[PDB]
Amino acid sequence: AEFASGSGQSTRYWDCCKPSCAWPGKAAVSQPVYACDANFQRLSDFNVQSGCNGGSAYSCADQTPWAVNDNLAYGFAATSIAGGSESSWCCACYALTFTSGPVAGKTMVVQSTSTGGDLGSNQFDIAMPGGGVGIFNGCSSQFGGLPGAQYGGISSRDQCDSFPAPLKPGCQWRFDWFQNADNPTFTFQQVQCPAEIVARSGCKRNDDSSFPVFTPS
């Protein structure tokens, strides 16, 4: 089907790795996702080696989540190879309407900018600094690591104050708008990416007009 839809579950992460959709040739897009140097400054080159494989390119701090209004957030996520190929999902956007936790009934629109190799078919790993470095600790090479559990990350908002400072706003969002929700479930619909999300990643799919225009729900 051309439209992704159904039920799923979210997790959280921030591993500092160059996103998978930041490389050329992954999908029919205007340009790949921007990657950044270790200081979080945008790279103009899309072919710089990932810091997770001994290189110098990392995830950008401006590709972090934020509150759009009381009931709506925008951000970025990793999605599965199990649920489809990178050509079908790199830089696509999805409106997640949460169905569990304190955020139940709220909506988050995420752009898929990366892949997780062992994610469930409709699993979205929502990028949040301090959500957990997981298996690949790119953050160790970027700036010596993040505190928190490998899986699940930090346990209090006040630990965001200790982070590399450009990561602080996205870290705080986890505790503020997201209410420290623990891996909430959702239903989802594919949507045309909001301009404000593309303004940060740089990456718009050639087929994006085929998907619903998103307004506050």
Q: Where are the domains of the chain?
A: 1-217
Which residues are designated catalytic? 15
80, 115 contact by CB (below 8 A): yes
Task: Supply 213's token pair.
Answer: 């225009």
Spatial separation of the C-alpha atoms in residues 95 and 5, rounded to whole Å: 10
Give the residue among 138, 199, 187, 182 at the shortest CA–CA distance from 7. Answer: 187
Rounded to a whole number, what is the distance in angstroms from the first to the last CA of the chain?
Answer: 24
Q: To 10 degrees, the CA torsion angle through 32, 37, 42, 48?
A: -30
Q: Which whole-number Å values give the CA distances from 61 to 32, 58, 162, in the listed order?
A: 16, 9, 15
Give me the sign of the Cα torsion angle 210, 82, 135, 22. negative
Q: Which fold has domain 1-217?
A: Barwin-like endoglucanases (2.40.40)
Residue entry with tokens 């690949």: 136
Task: Supply 131's token pair.
Answer: 């959500």
**What was the experiment behind these coordinates?**
X-ray
Total residues found in the chain within this entry: 217
Resolution of this deposited model, Å: 1.4
**DSSP character string of the chain:** --S-EEEEEEEEE---BPPGGGSTTSSSBSSPPP-B-TTSPBPS-S-PPBGGGTSSBB--TTSS-EEEETTEEEEEEEEESTT--HHHHTT-EEEEEE-SSTTTT-EEEEEEEEEETT--TTEEEEE-TTS--TT--HHHHHHS---SBTTTB-S-GGGGGGS-GGGHHHHHHHHTTTTT--S-EEEEEEEPPPHHHHHHH---BTTGGGSPPP---
167, 130 contact by CB (below 8 A): yes
Task: Supply 165's token pair.
Answer: 């400072």
Question: Could you tell me how far CA 26 lies from the centroid of its own chain?
Answer: 17
